[model samples]
Target chain A: TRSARVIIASTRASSDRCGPIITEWLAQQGFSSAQPEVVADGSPVGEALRKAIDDDVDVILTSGGTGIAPTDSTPDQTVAVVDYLIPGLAEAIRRSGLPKVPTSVLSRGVCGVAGQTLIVNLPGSPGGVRDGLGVLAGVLDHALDQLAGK
Target chain B: TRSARVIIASTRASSDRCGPIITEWLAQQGFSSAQPEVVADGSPVGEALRKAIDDDVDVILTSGGTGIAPTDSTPDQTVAVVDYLIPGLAEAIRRSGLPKVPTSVLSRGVCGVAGQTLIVNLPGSPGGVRDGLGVLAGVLDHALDQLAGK
Candidate 1:
């Protein structure tokens, strides 16, 4: 029942764009009523992500500020709350988008499991988020299953 | 020349068959003269892995004792010394071997970087090690390059 529950956090005000995009996208993948949290990108974003884990959601997908730029702080903020590192998710995300755009390396996206909640930090760009979730589509369900003790 | 320096730690008696097989396999993969460490599967094994990371080799490939059994302490041991977690490396290993064996779920391997060295823990079985390395072989060089600041 909780499998359909997911929290999508974004630090930008443009969640108006990613909100509908990711929601529709997740709907296609069988997730429903995805809650979109557009908060300030900093410790606020980190706390929101950690809050999702504390709330025990099935999965938490945060998009934005996952780069080396001064404003990019998603990965660093997220890592502080992660208990286990799911490095492959980010690696695969970069691997998927690299041939088309090598700058994908600059995106330090991270995926992990904090408690029973699966936390993934995706890129801010719509294309990056699509690619990140696309890379996750195949393994996401099984990952959730394993975490929930299926 | 940098490729030749890799430490392969195994959790087994000196007479274990996996020791030589993995060394030869690494040689086949261009990691010439890979040093293999065969030790008892316990606290001693963990210490050996930590010591390898502390020594700062280019990359360390540890095989064996990465399972659900009580003696499988390689991941925990290696993780303790790790400063940066490289989750994708381990995730890809499981994804690579899963189609071949459904029980790949049992391989609780972990990969990360401690200091400048990359430490990867592969499954203990000879077949598992080969499969694990085969998966790693494709991207390991690129990973090393990134770590070495290429």
Candidate 2:
């Protein structure tokens, strides 16, 4: 009985690997997710996120636009919108991948909540998205429960 | 020939442990540190940090005030003044201590740069302070070099 949205922040739509991967992951986790919403990085990502929040989604998972490049502004935009941050989730995501990929630390993806919806930024790559989901495995349920005031 | 300052964020300055621990760690790493400046948590931590930046210190290490309490605002203060965040360092700090301390993830400390100074938030305990400095061992020098444009 949970609803989710997968947001992809990319300049070109091309073949969408991350979107399918994320939607499948959500389905397995008991969340009914909408088809992934592809949007340009930076301000556009923020706009899509806000729209999803307005839709009253339970969770918003953003993929892409979280690197060291100047255009990697998903974190900045997310920070501007979230009521507060859940720093540990973001920290655990980076830590989980650091052993296999040292550059994983470069990801500035953040996690937080906005209007009862949990927002988490996943790395753009399909593999990274899986890793991010894995990091959330044990904690996501508890987080959702807390948000539900359970 | 690097200079550093230790700012302790506490409700009361009855006894100081983190400051001395941080100063000794800096000295061992070849930095000259000023006497630790004790400041209350929240807004005062930000004021002290900005003053240290204005003093042109090479590094600013803040101990305490990073927690889950409603009044815990060290991260907020530091985030407000930092030009950008170095999320990897904070991630590594929590990751390193997680095996020994399960609740290490709750520290919520942040690492960043303000002006030419490197600012890192350590937890509010003596043990957490040492753990934080240890996480910075391999990366701090390179971070400083990058900041110095070396």
Candidate 3:
């Protein structure tokens, strides 16, 4: 079935805080039913993940590299590969965090789908990642179900 | 005259599923009536709620935390404080759910107001809340007018 194939990826390599913690958090949330995969980070990380999705994956959760920093190319690269943009996810995260911290306004996270996979870019901070997940978790299953034509 | 005094709290309480449902979702669907108050999880929720507007109270719609989870604190504290009961708003949401999903039936949401505050707890799902507000977005201006001492 298409329900259990969720994948997780990050632009900061497996050693980074964003990817590992998010993958673990998802597991703790009982998403263990779906296997989560992480992608190694590089200049062409987005392309790598896209290729992997082409190989077949249901959803891709990318973390880090969504800031205004020089290497923050994840959003740009992901945008290049996705079919349709889901601005609501990013907007919701920003709105949720904006009031707590002014710097939350700096995130440029993006979300969309590549091939059959739904890809979401998350912020660098662990707290921000959790916040993003909290805001998005409620809609993920429905969105995935819709994307899979369920 | 009682309508203009109605205070609209626009923050997503931490105990709530996402953020304030009424302000964010309604705004997302192009329905603008109240401004968001942005509050932290467990912060003086009522103070933030009370400080959001300078009105006496006509209607306030909070979005989040009608669930049974520990963080689901919005309804527990709010429901007991509201004076009147408005079943029509919940009925409207229920009617709107016909086209959405069976999960809508599972929502333990509530609606009412404290003093002049007409509060309503909406779904935690961003899209769900947006769709619910979309149903009322069309008539929000008129609703506000009738509530705001127009």
Candidate 4:
């Protein structure tokens, strides 16, 4: 079976918990050796991810800073950088999580492709991250295959 | 096997060869008798569909007038009436079809819900309609099930 190359990033510093957990989960899922990277919040996060794409990461999963708080700008910044939007992943996360919590609808976590990388915004909580990842795990390979021009 | 209910509607009263074929295809797929209805090419189309939802239609699939043509308002009308936007279905359809035809990117075909009904805007071309349905068929049930509170 072909394995996906994964790169995990979050809007906080390198010490963030969400990033490491995602990296661990991806590695446990057998994605070779999944690597976790960090991007500072605010104006530069999108640019950093765009650079990662240019360096050829197959999947870029971002955590935190995607809420309605004052610092929340993950989705907006992502929208600025992505060439095309993949609204289904976002909708799926929202729909699946809404039954558990109504605040799920307020999550601006967006997903799209910038250059060749498939970027997905996930909630900061461990359970939320797990839920978002589980929703897309079944289809991410097919999505990446299409993105890779297969 | 659980049957899905789909209601086909159009903004204009004008008849097109694509509508009946789509209706038949849905029926053949065990869609519990898909029916195509029409409304004028404006606000009335959306209003009529809202009425259908009030009448308990599960899924609403609209064809025609979803393009850039001046009379094209299916997307706008859909946006006006739906309670919640279903961006994933729209994004997936565009991602799947845009590579085949650039015009697919230009389509404003929207998807949303009115009460319990899941409504989607499809391209007017017979082939486009077919492709749209094919792309959506896999997720429509799950989406409708979610909306219907199953």
Best by TM-score: 1
Clashing pairs in 1: A87-B87, A87-B88, A88-B87, A88-B88, B64-B124
**What lDDT tens digits, residue by residue, belong to model 1 across residues A1-150?**
444333344445733466567777777877655467677767778777766666667777877878887777778878898765655566767767778988998888887666677777777778888887786776777767656546
Using TM-score as the measure, what is the rank order of every candidate, best first?
Answer: 1, 2, 4, 3
Top candidate on DockQ is 2
- Model 4 lDDT vs. the true structure? 0.68
DockQ of each: 0.14, 0.17, 0.03, 0.07
> Candidate 3 residues B1-150, lDDT tens each?
323211222234422434445545545644345445445433344555555334554555556544323344454455556665565565466446643463353344556646545566665566667666766666556655654566
lDDT of 4 by residue, B1-150 (tens): 333333344444444667687778677666754355656677767676676666676677788766544456677778888888877688777556654664454456788887777788887787788888888778877786777677
- Candidate 4 runs further than 4 Å off: A1-15, A32-34, B1-20, B23-150
CA lDDT, every prediction?
0.69, 0.84, 0.57, 0.68
In candidate 3, what are the lDDT values of residues A1-150, reduced to their tens digit?
Answer: 332232334444544566566767666655542344555444455656655576566666766677787767777877888865555456666766777877887888887666567777777678888888886666677666656645
Q: Indicate which candidate wins on lDDT.
A: 2
Candidate 2 structure, TM-score to reference? 0.60
lDDT of 2 by residue, A34-134 (tens): 88889887788889988998989889999998765545678998998899999889978887776776657757899999979999999888888989999
| Docking category of candidate 3 | incorrect
Q: Where does model 2 exceed 4 Å of error?
A: A12-15, B1-81, B93-110, B113-150
- TM-scores for all candidates: the values are 0.64, 0.60, 0.47, 0.54
Query: lDDT tens string, model 1, B19-130?
Result: 6776776677776544666766667666776766555467777777665444556777777778878766787787777656545654567989877777788877777877
Report the poorest 10 consecutive residues by lDDT, candidate 4 chain A. Answer: A1-10
Please state the CAPRI-style docking class of candidate 4. incorrect
